[PDB]
Design a protein around this ligand. Sequence first.
Ligand SMILES: [Mg+2]
Length: 727
Amino acid sequence: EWLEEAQENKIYFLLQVDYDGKKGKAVCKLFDKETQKIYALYDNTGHKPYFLVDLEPDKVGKIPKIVRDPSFDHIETVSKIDPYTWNKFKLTKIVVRDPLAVRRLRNDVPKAYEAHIKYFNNYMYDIGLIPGMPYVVKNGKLESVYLSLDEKDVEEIKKAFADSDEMTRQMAVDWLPIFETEIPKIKRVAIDIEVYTPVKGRIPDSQKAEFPIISIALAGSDGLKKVLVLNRNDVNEGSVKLDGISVERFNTEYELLGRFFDILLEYPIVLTFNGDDFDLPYIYFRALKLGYFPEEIPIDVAGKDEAKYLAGLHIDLYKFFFNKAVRNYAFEGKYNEYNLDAVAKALLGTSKVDTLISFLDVEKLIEYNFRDAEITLQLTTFNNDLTMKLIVLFSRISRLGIEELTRTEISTWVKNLYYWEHRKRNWLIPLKEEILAKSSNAVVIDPPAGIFFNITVLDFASLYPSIIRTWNLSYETVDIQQCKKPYEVKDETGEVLHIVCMDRPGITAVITGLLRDFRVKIYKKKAKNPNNSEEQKLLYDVVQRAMKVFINATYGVFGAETFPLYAPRVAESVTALGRYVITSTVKKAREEGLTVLYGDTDSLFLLNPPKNSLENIIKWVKTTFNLDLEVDKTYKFVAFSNYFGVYQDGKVDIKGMLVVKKVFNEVKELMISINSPNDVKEIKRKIVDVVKGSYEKLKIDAEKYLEALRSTFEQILRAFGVSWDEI
Ligand SMILES: [Mg+2]
């Protein structure tokens, strides 16, 4: 087909596994840096799709809907460890011939386990594969390659985990390679099409593909800059350059797409921005109405919300940046909108258009079309290929393949890590129902309003993740029946909301703790350490960024009730101990001479205290619980009413309350940047616009319009003065 088979005893980077319905096998998609191509290794083990049932082989054999099904293969018996007790028991295993038979047969039995795992992930779990990592093909199977590490590097890992439990220490050595292994440079082309629209504001159905493609832009990471354009009211195919952009011209759309395929086929990865929904399907269905056979088109659009590029991987980057964990934790909330221009400005700082693109002359169509594709490539290129590296590390940590990962929420990424590790341990992955039944048997402190001076803030570095590990919280250690070493988890009235077993390490506690400690104890440090070469400085930086994404996302996914491993008592125990830690840390500040103005879930705003008293409560947290409290910030001053920070170098951290609006904004911020310890005359400069903006504006909207001017100023005047009227 489009993919050539991988060769015996060559080395490739695994990128993902797919299922081939035709051959009925899992296929590993293997990247070769030498040829810059992707090859296929088809499973040569006996591996088939399956699910588990806790009935007996002879009873399952009397269910004729299973046994007489054409995809029915055979029944076996396997063993699993119960996460709750670590006891070994037996389950029966229904093996069928194809993934679809798993979906069909799993409800012919009362209670099917491991029956909602996509076949290519289930293969990954059982073989023990890690995408984004290098392997050698030995006897048609993948074997991991030798990793060259400094002895000092590995001693440094082992020292940081010497105090941890058996599970953590071996898991730490088992994960090391995925943080020390180089990331491959993968050749890639972002593409972007434009189609003809008679009416201006009307996005054409990409299935119907009613109108011609007028151009396609291709921006490649190997320097390619291309625009293929359809000659509309003229007829010659001459080629030219336009500020570095190779423009080719075509009289028929058939030959335009012909040549788009030829170029596409040079790349192992195609990048789009919303190409799953638009670009690739539009190309695919135009190509069919133009006289391409299905089998000549290296795109498949048979999947529901997906476009596959048959000679490699297609990453739709719309879906990557729209990922909420990527948006918030990878890129610090820098974009609020998910369209190309919004993401590009936030991450690249690169800023429109007169008419619709159907009206545009050839020259402006070419610049505009190419710019879209160029920006799409650059989202993958900025900061020494940061986002290619993030994607690869995210695959490694989640063990999800690249295409599934860039199209899924982080809760799918975390689920996949946890299923993988269960399966490596031979643990049964529990049903969501069973976690509920096996579980069976008031705010943050407010800020006084006004003006307060020289404030230092105190943050818990990563609070919820840190308490997950510190208190051994996991779905299998909270509110369980048989428990030798219980631990009470109270909140306020010493109520004892839940019990937590310390008999065994909880898997969630082990993994979040291990990720966290890999980050703070080793990789944060290593990344900004001058003795490291610049190549490995960048690797370690991405490593710690990516760790951060999973750490900070962990509570949110485990706290959502849709999550397959959601235990209400885990989530509730986390917030409980969160209150307990911040409440308790508040009392110690009140008994050290510290004045506590503001306090949310993991932060404490402190009124200029001595350096002696800060060091007391920090080291006190380390002895009471085992958390790291630290000196976050040092505001020049802050104002309250929801707050309004000010730094001594300029910039302000205005929490909320920022939705005339342009000229007036700049005056307010340079007036507040003047701020010294004075007060009453500082506010009279700003009171010029209270009565001015409110009362003078005479010379859908009528007279209530002036309350919308007041909402970009409502909370700031509450700090200084009080409320007023002008009727
Ligand atoms: Mg475009």
